[PDB]
Design a protein around this ligand. Structure first.
Ligand SMILES: [Mg+2]
Ligand SMILES: [Zn+2]
Ligand SMILES: [Zn+2]
Lengths: 49, 48, 65, 1200, 50, 49
DNA sequence: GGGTATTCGCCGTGTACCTCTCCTAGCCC
DNA sequence: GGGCTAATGACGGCGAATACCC
RNA sequence: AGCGGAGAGGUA
């Protein structure tokens, strides 16, 4: 649990975009794990990639 | 008491471990070092 | 510490009086009312102990020694 | 080596003295100092660990190596004392006499001391009336000396010996200088110089004559001799003070003094061998030259010879400098019972308590744990108690918890530029490895929580514990030493919760109802039936102080009603009714400290921090990429600026305007574009959310994370917000030129490489700027501390009725310091009110209601005390709101408060504000014109300057012109040192009618005619301008040359109080251009310390061209004019000295040789033979006695 | 591109979701930014400095 | 500090010139790895941040 | 003798803490 | 290999000696 | 076995 008060003082907002991209990457990894958990076909994984 | 004096830190330590309170201060030894270093420059420095 | 600054005006005189009272209490004596310095400050703030009584107790301890 | 029987006895040295006397040393006294003579330059023999006899490390000269032992081993008992062994002659005594006893060297030829010759105030050059180059050529064996004082080349000496047939004696070297110093007299030469002083008529020759008179007077009244300057016998250091350090494998580390001593002994033995051989004159001359060079390298290496890839240290470098024996071992010492660790944040702690690790507190409180374990009976000896401590059972934790309960510790920040860098806390035992700290403490410490370490110290005496409880506790140190504002302010995370709780909204659930008291509001909010931001009219009961209770109905917010549960009964509801901001909670804390007390403010700040954390956690304030809005108006003004810069580029390339004016137009239109884009960004951020109330959209303030974090405080300002939403504007280069193209992109969008290059250029410039600012601030803080350290509040009343006139400072724009800040805190002198009465906020409010303009104040620059400041002239204290106590050192606090913000430093008269205009010193024919205005309340907001012949057009409204037309830290350092400017403004010497100039002989002449007095001519260079009218009158202190004035001609011409007023005005102008607030008592006591010396012109007891103190001259004058005299005392003028020269011109030779030029003050105290009376603060630290300020004033009163 | 990679999965567009407090079980007033950040550990230990 | 080289290839697989065979200290399968991945929340939490 | 005008030196330029290495080695047998 | 063995990438403020025609 | 002079890196 970080503090958001340092963002307008230190004037960097690249960490917010890094947090959003990491959230999207973890969502994609969870979706890939949910696709490969059940009996799925190769064409669905191919079109998802 | 804590840093410079040789007998002062021993007296303070034994007064701490004995319980009595009698603090006797003294001159720092570095002042005597400075006096002996000034006296080596052929300059007389006396404690009147 | 506001009452201790109320019963006497000067602060360093209060420090010296509390130091004398703590030196009298640390050797072992009955207080006027757990640490010796805190009990000395509580006895000062309650207007129970004076500097003349401290000097009388110190003279009695010097005569008894 | 090891001794335990002698180690137990104590109280052998009393160390009780009054003064310290320093003088010269006769060779017989140096011979009586030592115990033996060294002859061989051998320290330790090879292949054996034994000292060499008659060497630098010897047992026959200094002392034995092992304790109660000889070199051979004939005496191996402690009963043998005072007996000298027969084979190797040494005394069977203690091994600590090797640190005390010293030796001496018999030189074959006398040498000259380099501290009396190589210094720029040369003493041998003034005593022999010779230049430095002549004695430098004579002492280095290049010429001859007749014996009346003239130089002789060796060929000229040969012709003189051939013409005189070897009858007139002439010697060369240091022996001729010793004979010249021996055959001179001190009395008859003094009468001869006093006879020549009454017949001279030159200027610099009179200065040379009075310098020679002062030197002869010092040599007469000191009891020394002129022939004692040359060194016949050279003493050496004890060998325990210069020990040898061994390395792995039997090797020893190299030394600096031992090599110089070996070189001196070897060259002296070579000179003795050449003298016994009866060598010719050239060889013994070169040997004496080498002996003089080795003595010069031994005394002060690096001055003339610089004997060596790296120059080794000497006796002179071991005293002076930062790494000497004076700054590393006397002022700052390594202490025990201390440690350091990193710091974290603890929200559960109180203000007076802090955290402490378990093993750290076990290591610090180990003697008390040992004493309590001996008292409880768990261990008979301390060895079993130590093994039980290292075993770490539960009983040692019980002992450590019982010991640390009422024992305070001193927490210290590693930089201690603040007065509150050291605070006392009651530590608790935590299960960690760091030191937990309260969040209201790190504001005064200026400490972050990323790699910050804090060194702790524990007081162990009862007096030290009571001093730490009384005058070092964090609950007692609320107010700042610089200004009256409290140093404890709620930081960003609690004022964020207070700003989220105090805001109100238009349409929310649970509004429009009436509640009984605060408990019903709490019960309604805790059941989630009413929102936090709802306009709910509640009823609260509050008492009013003069204590009468009352009830009323107020229309507030639910959060403002929940905030009322922590306010005490003394504070009114008019302070907490508005929205909580940084300045609002700061003035609320100030009012709670003013009208209620001390401990209630502490518990109110604790509850305020608690509710701020509790309502900032529930808020969930977060910043994201959607919170920052980008306007279309930014792109619109960007295309407009692109079209305008294309138009001005076509206009510049057409040939109508130049390049520089076009570039200035480009940077002005880009500044206007950046200002409009920032205004549009602030308008679309702060006025974004529009709420709908009762079917109608009513506009209110937006609730965004960036806007709330910018509006609440303790975060970035609007300049930080405009760099994220709009364009950041133009960038600056370090040479002074602005770049022609700006950065038209924020951090939300991408940045190009050419913009990032200018960004890192500005970042590197700012980093270098704050590095040099920190270094210069530390140096200025050290200098200001060492200047003002003798001022101690000694007496309660003095009886001075001089006074000082206080005026509000207006510099042609906004006000620098108003009347309510400059007047509050001191007593008054004359009746405006009753004299000698301390002013409070009620008296300031009464004076503001009475509309007073100027009141006489009692300052410290006009005091009549003996070596101290009166308690009434200083006013009130800054840490406490009452009167200043007797014994408070108000110099170190003032210098530290001035040294606070140094790391943070860097025609037409049209009025701005409305109000009636009142002219001051007007007759337009006016020399000094002031266009001051008076507002409705009675304060002066604007004050403009009026030149000669200014046409004034004029109950004057704003927006008009009364007079239409009439055609960082180095600054503070130059103000405190009082350096002469590059263009000094020449002032009028006398008050008279201006006359025409005389004949020009390379410089302009200005004569001022008087009624009876003759005209005075002042030379001025023709390169500078001059404004003197022919038929005009010049008043006293007028400026005829336009320029920056010096403090010297301001002090010496018209008075002392306008000089201090100008200094306070300029320093406050700098500190208010920065933005900080520093009280004027510090600048006043600095100005008082700078005016310590006085100059007399014609006296009967003292000289006519010498400087002395003010109070010493006053007591000598009253003692002279008291009995048997009528025309005794003389008239003197006040002189000014800089911060570099005031601390050096001190009779105390210890404090004067403390920070700068140790060799000059040491040789001055050696020649004059001064006596240090130890009446100071730093010399009591050096000697080791109590400080004569605070609790140590009673000891100094009982001593004398 | 970041909004498209967020919208490809079952994730919100703004990157701010509403999370509940674990201490009392209640909901916060606003939505906070949740995500994975590459966080590392420095060499300045607490045992070396204490 | 401790340095370690753990292998990543398997038994019986063809490779080319330039492929990695063992990941070094603070090193992934061919990318540089300095820290870990973990959930971040930008909010004040009872004054501990 | 006596006022400017350069000119050679003297003397100073933040505090606290944590790791590591390397210390006079040269020679005629 | 072995054991004695005696450079010239700072910068600012300031008091004191030379030069010299009137 | 304890007492140290340089050089380099890093944190506030
Ligand atoms: Mg920090
Ligand atoms: Zn012997
Ligand atoms: Zn006074």
């Amino acid at each position: 649990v970080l503090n958001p008060l340092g963002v307008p003082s230190r004037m960097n907002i690249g960490q917010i975009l890094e947090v959003h991209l990491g959230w999207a990457a973890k969502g994609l990894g969870r979706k890939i794990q949910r696709m490969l958990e059940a009996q799925a076909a190769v064409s669905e994984l191919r079109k998802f990639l | 008491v804590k840093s410079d004096d040789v007998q002062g830190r021993n007296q303070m330590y034994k007064n701490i471990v004995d319980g009595e309170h009698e603090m006797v201060a003294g001159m720092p030894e570095s002042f005597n070092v400075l006096v002996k270093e000034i006296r080596s420059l052929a300059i007389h420095m006396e404690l009147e | 510490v506001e009452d201790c600054l109320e019963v006497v005006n000067n602060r360093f005189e209060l420090v010296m009086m509390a130091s004398k009272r703590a030196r009298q209490l640390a050797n072992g004596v009955q207080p006027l009312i757990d640490k010796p310095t805190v009990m000395a400050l509580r006895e000062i703030a309650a207007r129970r102990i004076d500097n003349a009584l401290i000097d009388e107790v110190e003279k009695a301890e010097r005569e008894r020694a | 080596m090891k001794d335990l029987l002698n180690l137990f006895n104590q109280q052998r040295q009393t160390l009780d003295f009054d003064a310290i006397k320093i003088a010269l040393a006769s060779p017989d006294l140096i011979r009586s100092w030592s115990y033996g003579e060294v002859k061989k330059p051998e320290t330790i023999n090879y292949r054996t660990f034994k000292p060499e006899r008659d060497g630098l490390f010897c047992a026959a000269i200094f002392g034995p190596i092992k304790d109660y032992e000889c070199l051979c081993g004939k005496y191996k008992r402690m009963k043998h004392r005072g007996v000298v062994c027969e084979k190797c002659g040494t005394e069977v005594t203690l091994a600590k006499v090797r640190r005390e006893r010293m030796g001496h060297i018999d030189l074959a030829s006398p040498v000259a001391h380099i501290w009396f010759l190589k210094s720029l105030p040369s003493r041998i050059g003034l005593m022999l009336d010779m230049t430095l180059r002549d004695i430098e050529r004579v002492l280095y064996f290049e010429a001859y000396v007749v014996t009346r004082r003239q130089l002789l080349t060796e060929e000229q000496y040969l012709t003189a010996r051939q013409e005189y047939n070897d009858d007139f004696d002439a010697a060369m070297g240091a022996e001729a200088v010793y004979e010249l110093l021996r055959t001179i007299d001190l009395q008859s030469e003094m009468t001869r110089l006093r006879e020549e002083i009454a017949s001279t008529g030159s200027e610099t020759k009179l200065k040379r004559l009075t310098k020679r008179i002062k030197l002869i007077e010092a040599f007469l009244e000191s009891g020394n001799r002129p022939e004692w300057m040359v060194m016949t016998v050279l003493p050496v250091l004890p060998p325990d003070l210069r020990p040898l350090v061994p390395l792995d494998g039997g090797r020893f580390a190299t030394s600096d003094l031992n090599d110089l001593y070996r070189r001196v002994i070897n060259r002296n033995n070579r000179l003795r061998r050449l003298l016994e051989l009866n060598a010719p004159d050239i060889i013994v001359r070169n040997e004496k030259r080498m002996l003089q060079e080795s003595v010069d390298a031994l005394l002060d290496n690096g001055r003339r010879g610089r004997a060596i890839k790296r120059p080794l240290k000497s006796l002179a470098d071991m005293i002076k400098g930062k790494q000497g024996r004076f700054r590393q071992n006397l002022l700052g010492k390594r202490v025990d019972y201390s440690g350091r660790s990193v710091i974290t944040v603890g929200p559960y702690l109180k203000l007076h308590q802090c955290g402490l690790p378990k093993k750290m507190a076990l290591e610090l409180f180990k003697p008390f744990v040992f004493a309590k374990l001996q008292r409880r009976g768990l261990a008979t000896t301390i060895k079993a108690a130590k093994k039980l401590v290292e075993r770490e059972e539960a009983e040692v934790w019980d002992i450590l918890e019982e010991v640390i309960r009422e024992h305070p510790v001193l927490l210290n920040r590693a930089p201690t530029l603040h007065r509150l860098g050291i605070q006392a806390f009651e530590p608790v035992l935590i299960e960690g490895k760091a030191i937990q700290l309260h969040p209201l403490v790190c504001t005064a410490f200026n400490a972050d929580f990323d790699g910050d370490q804090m060194a702790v110290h524990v007081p162990l005496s009862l007096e030290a514990q009571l001093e730490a409880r009384a005058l070092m506790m964090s609950t007692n140190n609320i107010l700042s030493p610089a200004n009256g504002e409290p140093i404890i302010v709620p930081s960003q995370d609690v004022v964020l919760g207070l700003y989220y709780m105090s805001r109100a909204l238009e349409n929310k659930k649970g509004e429009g109802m009436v509640f009984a008291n605060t408990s019903e509001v709490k019960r309604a909010y805790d059941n989630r039936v009413v929102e936090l931001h709802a306009k709910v009219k509640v009823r609260i009961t509050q008492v009013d102080v003069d204590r009468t209770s009352g009830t009323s109905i107020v229309d507030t917010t639910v959060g403002r009603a929940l905030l009322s549960e922590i306010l005490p009964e003394g504070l009114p509801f008019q302070l907490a009714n508005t929205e909580m901001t940084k300045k609002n909670i700061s003035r609320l804390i100030n009012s709670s400290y003013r009208l209620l007390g001390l401990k209630d403010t502490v518990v109110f700040a604790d509850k305020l921090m608690y509710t701020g954390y509790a309502y900032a956690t529930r808020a969930g304030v977060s910043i994201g990429i959607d919170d920052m809005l980008i306007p279309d108006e930014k792109k619109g003004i960007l295309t407009e600026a692109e079209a305008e810069v294309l138009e001005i580029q076509e206009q510049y390339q057409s040939g109508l305007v130049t390049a520089g004016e076009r570039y200035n137009k480009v940077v002005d239109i880009w500044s206007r574009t950046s200002e409009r884009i920032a205004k549009a960004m602030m308008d679309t951020i702060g006025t974004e959310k529009v709420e709908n109330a009762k079917g109608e959209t009513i506009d209110q303030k937006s609730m965004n994370s960036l806007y709330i974090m910018a509006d609440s405080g303790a975060r970035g300002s609007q300049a930080q917000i405009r760099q994220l939403a709009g364009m950041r504007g133009l960038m600056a280069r370090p040479d002074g030129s602005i770049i022609e193209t700006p950065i038209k992109a924020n951090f939300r969008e991408g940045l190009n490489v050419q913009e990032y290059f200018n960004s890192t250029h500005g970042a590197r410039k700012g980093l270098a700027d704050t590095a040099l600012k920190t270094a210069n601030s530390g140096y200025l803080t050290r200098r200001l501390v060492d200047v003002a350290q003798d001022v101690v509040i000694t007496e309660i009343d003095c009886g001075t009725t001089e006074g000082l006139i206080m005026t509000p400072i207006v510099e042609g724009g906004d006000v620098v310091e108003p009347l309510k800040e400059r007047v509050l805190g001191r007593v008054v002198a004359e009746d405006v009110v009753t004299r000698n009465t301390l002013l409070d906020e009620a008296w300031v409010a009464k004076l503001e209601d009475a509309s007073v303009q100027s009141v006489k104040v009692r300052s410290t620059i006009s005091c009549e005390s003996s070596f101290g400041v009166c308690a009434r002239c200083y006013g009130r204290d800054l840490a406490r709101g009452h009167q200043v106590n007797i014994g408070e050192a108000v110099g170190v606090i003032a210098a530290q408060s001035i040294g606070e913000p140094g790391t943070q430093l860097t025609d037409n008269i049209t009025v701005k504000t409305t109000g009636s205009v009142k002219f001051n010193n007007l007759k337009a024919v006016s020399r000094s014109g002031e266009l001051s205005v008076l507002d409705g309340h009675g304060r002066e907001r604007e004050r403009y300057k009026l030149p000669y012949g200014a046409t004034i057009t004029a109950a004057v409204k704003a927006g008009q012109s009364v007079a239409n037309w009439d055609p960082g830290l180095p600054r503070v350092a130059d103000l405190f040192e009082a350096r002469k400017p590059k263009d000094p403004a020449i002032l009028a010497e006398r008050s008279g009618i201006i006359s025409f100039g005389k004949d020009t002989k390379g410089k302009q002449r200005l004569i001022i005619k008087d009624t009876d007095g003759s005209e005075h001519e002042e030379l001025i260079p023709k390169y500078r301008q001059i404004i003197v009218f022919e038929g005009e009158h010049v008043t006293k202190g007028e400026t005829v040359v336009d320029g920056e004035p010096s403090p010297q001609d301001i002090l010496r011409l018209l008075g002392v109080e306008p000089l201090a007023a100008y200094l306070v005005k300029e320093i406050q102008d700098v500190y208010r251009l920065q933005g900080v607030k520093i009280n004027d008592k510090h600048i006043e006591v600095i100005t008082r310390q700078m005016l310590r010396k006085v100059e007399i012109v014609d006296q009967g007891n003292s000289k006519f061209l010498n400087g002395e103190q003010v109070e010493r001259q006053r007591v000598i004058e009253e003692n002279a004019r008291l009995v048997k005299r009528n025309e005794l005392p003389a008239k003197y003028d006040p002189v000014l000295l800089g911060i570099t020269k005031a601390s050096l011109a001190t009779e105390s030779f210890i404090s004067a040789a403390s920070f700068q030029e140790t060799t000059r003050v040491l040789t001055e105290a050696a020649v004059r033979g001064t006596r240090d009376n130890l009446r100071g603060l730093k010399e009591n630290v050096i000697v080791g006695r109590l400080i004569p300020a605070g609790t140590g004033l009673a000891y100094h009163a009982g001593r004398r | 591109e970041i909004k498209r990679m967020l919208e490809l999965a079952d994730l919100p567009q703004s990157g701010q979701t509403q999370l509940y407090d674990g201490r009392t079980g209640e909901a916060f007033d606003r939505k906070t930014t949740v995500g994975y950040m590459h966080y590392l550990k420095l060499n300045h230990l607490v045992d070396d400095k204490m | 500090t401790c340095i370690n080289q753990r292998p990543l290839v398997n038994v019986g697989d063809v490779i080319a010139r330039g492929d990695v065979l063992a990941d070094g200290p603070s090193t992934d399968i061919g990318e540089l790895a300095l820290g870990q991945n973990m959930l971040i929340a930008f909010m004040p939490w009872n004054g501990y941040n």
